[PDB]
Amino acid sequence: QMPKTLRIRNGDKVRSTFSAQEYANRQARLRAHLAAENIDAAIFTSYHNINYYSDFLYCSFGRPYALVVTEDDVISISANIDGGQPWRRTVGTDNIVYTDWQRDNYFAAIQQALPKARRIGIEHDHLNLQNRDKLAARYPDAELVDVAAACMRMRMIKSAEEHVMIRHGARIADIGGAAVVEALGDQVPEYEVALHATQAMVRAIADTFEDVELMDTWTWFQSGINTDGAHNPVTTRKVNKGDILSLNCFPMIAGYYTALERTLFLDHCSDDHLRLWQVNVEVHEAGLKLIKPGARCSDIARELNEIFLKHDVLQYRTFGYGHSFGTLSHYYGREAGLELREDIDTVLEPGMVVSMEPMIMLPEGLPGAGGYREHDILIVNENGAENITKFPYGPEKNIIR
Amino acid sequence: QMPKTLRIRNGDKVRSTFSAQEYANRQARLRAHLAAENIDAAIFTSYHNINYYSDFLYCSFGRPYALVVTEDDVISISANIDGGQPWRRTVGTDNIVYTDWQRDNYFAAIQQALPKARRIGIEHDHLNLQNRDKLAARYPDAELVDVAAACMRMRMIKSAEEHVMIRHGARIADIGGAAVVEALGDQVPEYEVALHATQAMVRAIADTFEDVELMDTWTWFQSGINTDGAHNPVTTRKVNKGDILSLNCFPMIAGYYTALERTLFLDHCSDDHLRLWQVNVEVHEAGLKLIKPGARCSDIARELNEIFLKHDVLQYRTFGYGHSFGTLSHYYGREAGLELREDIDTVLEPGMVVSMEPMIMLPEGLPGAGGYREHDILIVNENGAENITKFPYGPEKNIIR
Numbered sequence A, B: 001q002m003p004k005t006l007r008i009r010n011g012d013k014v015r016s017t018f019s020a021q022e023y024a025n026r027q028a029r030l031r032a033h034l035a036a037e038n039i040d041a042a043i044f045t046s047y048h049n050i051n052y053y054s055d056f057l058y059c060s061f062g063r064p065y066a067l068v069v070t071e072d073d074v075i076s077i078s079a080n081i082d083g084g085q086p087w088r089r090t091v092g093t094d095n096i097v098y099t100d101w102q103r104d105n106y107f108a109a110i111q112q113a114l115p116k117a118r119r120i121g122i123e124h125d126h127l128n129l130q131n132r133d134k135l136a137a138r139y140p141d142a143e144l145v146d147v148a149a150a151c152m153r154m155r156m157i158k159s160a161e162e163h164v165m166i167r168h169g170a171r172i173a174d175i176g177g178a179a180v181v182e183a184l185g186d187q188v189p190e191y192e193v194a195l196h197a198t199q200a201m202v203r204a205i206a207d208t209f210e211d212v213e214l215m216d217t218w219t220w221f222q223s224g225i226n227t228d229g230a231h232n233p234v235t236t237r238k239v240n241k242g243d244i245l246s247l248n249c250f251p252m253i254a255g256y257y258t259a260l261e262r263t264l265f266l267d268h269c270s271d272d273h274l275r276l277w278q279v280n281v282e283v284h285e286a287g288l289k290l291i292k293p294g295a296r297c298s299d300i301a302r303e304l305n306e307i308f309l310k311h312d313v314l315q316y317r318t319f320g321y322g323h324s325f326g327t328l329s330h331y332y333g334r335e336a337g338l339e340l341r342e343d344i345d346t347v348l349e350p351g352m353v354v355s356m357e358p359m360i361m362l363p364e365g366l367p368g369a370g371g372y373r374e375h376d377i378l379i380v381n382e383n384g385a386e387n388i389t390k391f392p393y394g395p396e397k398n399i400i401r
């Protein structure tokens, strides 16, 4: 007979990514929230809140995943395909597996985990209509309430242990920087260098952590037109001497993202290029000093925009000055409170980890046409910000010969 | 606060994946569906449905995207950070760019593409709550109705251009195969082996295809207990001879997924493992003979289950026998009306592309503990099915000496 749910407690639970106290403290806070709002349970569906509160980063493949938090339990809800793996990772009190063998066994693992509730916490910014229709009909009485906004402002501030991991990741993003430069060669295709820098960083992650999963780490190396978009995919484009290049290296550790992005030039850079690179570096140096406790996001933006207006390129600009770090990727995560944009009145506090990442982009046509961008990570402390990114920027270094 | 929407026509339109006629055929069948439903526009927000229809595969990083499809238009809605890259990919009539500079500019660009509707068709299995509440507030006069079910069933039957694409990708997965075998040494870490395979594949895609974007292509290469869930993340475990191994190699080409998966051993396989591999290989060669037009998914599950039950192992199956190919990856797509599951009664039809990947998994400590899995892809045609997976399976060849 084909059961709807099981348990697969296979092999031993791994050494987790953060201490037990770290997890206990995040799970404590979130429950002080539930309790304050008379929310019986949270059901998380998103990669990044599952990961943040239990150390399990799931693989969706178009199956649903869940983490159900009550005052007493933390229960991960995985697919039978994953075997014992979700259980050996979860920092929580249980793991219930659902199977393929009937439709919507997932909502039976859920109702298993949380047999009754008058008020349930869901991620409005992540749960879809069909799944919400589903969950509401397993609990027609419950009130379903957002929790995502309250949990994002709790992830907005980093722990010390979070800061140490973001330091190690910025050290690795530094190594993938150096392996970009080594690989970098006239007539090199973009994908050769991106393979090279990827292997250099997976291989340092493997090195620094023992019970580490090696996932999703990547490199975007962009050249010539392909620098016109800060997330444009790797292409077969051969690098020529003098072309504008963009180095972007992203170690992914345990769901934790860090980045190194850097304008570079092979052999030379022309003076129409050098002079726009030197305006972009001047706004980057300025924003470094603007990252301080007590600074409001909105104001950092307007302060910085005056520099680009002084130089007649403010229109070249393409995206916010910086965002928040933490557990996020290109496909999950990101604390929307946390963005360096013209209408975000958020004040920086100690503990936050923000980037500084000015960009200008000049279309094809214009002298110096191409994307320029430099990206550092700062940790907000007492007294200022500690910039953790040590690879050099700007023309004094990044014209490679 | 500076503009909200703009256009960037930067550079030239790339050479698309498919033929213009392939994109005209897809958008003509979508429009015949919307007009028969009297739905004024579809708004797609999913990776898969935007890729399917317009050949633009976006990078979220926590920004929303759209494809708005009318009887006359196809407009993509991409963020200012990507500059010109969306428009160069979009097989459509317009691209509109929204900026970061004020909140929910994205909505301002959709109301720009689609100034008035009465009934707008959206994806319930993808769209989130919060966005759906913002959309509805834009268009209070308008009925939001699901199109993702209509679209999945359209996607389910591939054209011949899609077939030839999926042959290409299975060829390159057979190249990623042989690089696993190249790389396999005693006491090789999992990650090294993954890295050597996926470099093999990146470079193959980059030969074959022109105008191609090199993204997402991975390997899972699992040893010992890490073979206990098919989607399990590379670790730094080293391979011992005799360990049970799993090779899984996934070329990701223009949003088109294919995969090779094979049990293998280095130098020898115990008795207990051999016995269990030969069962799983037996159920695989039966599943290959059941895949044919007319067949029900339900009857296929339930015949192979009889085989496994004859070897008293059925209780060790972990997931469905296989699924539908097309535009998907680990983080998007998958045609849920296409699954080789016990209660699914879709009938296979020519042009479907499915897998056959039986698995059993025995928990540590039982004799022949580990995960066993073979995985081929089959094109369904008018007479049977063509199996595109050419790498060998079973012990005759996958005991690597």
Ligand SMILES: CN(CC(=O)O)C(N)=O
Pocket (backbone or CB within 6 Å): A230, A231, A259, A261, A319, A320, A322, A323, A357, A375, B061, B081
């Ligand atoms: C993450 N990304 C920034 C953004 O999406 O705002 C970068 N660094 O290009």
Ligand SMILES: CN(CC(=O)O)C(N)=O
Pocket (backbone or CB within 6 Å): A061, A081, B230, B231, B259, B261, B319, B320, B322, B323, B357, B375
């Ligand atoms: C995609 N995955 C199959 C599934 O999720 O059912 C692989 N082949 O292991």
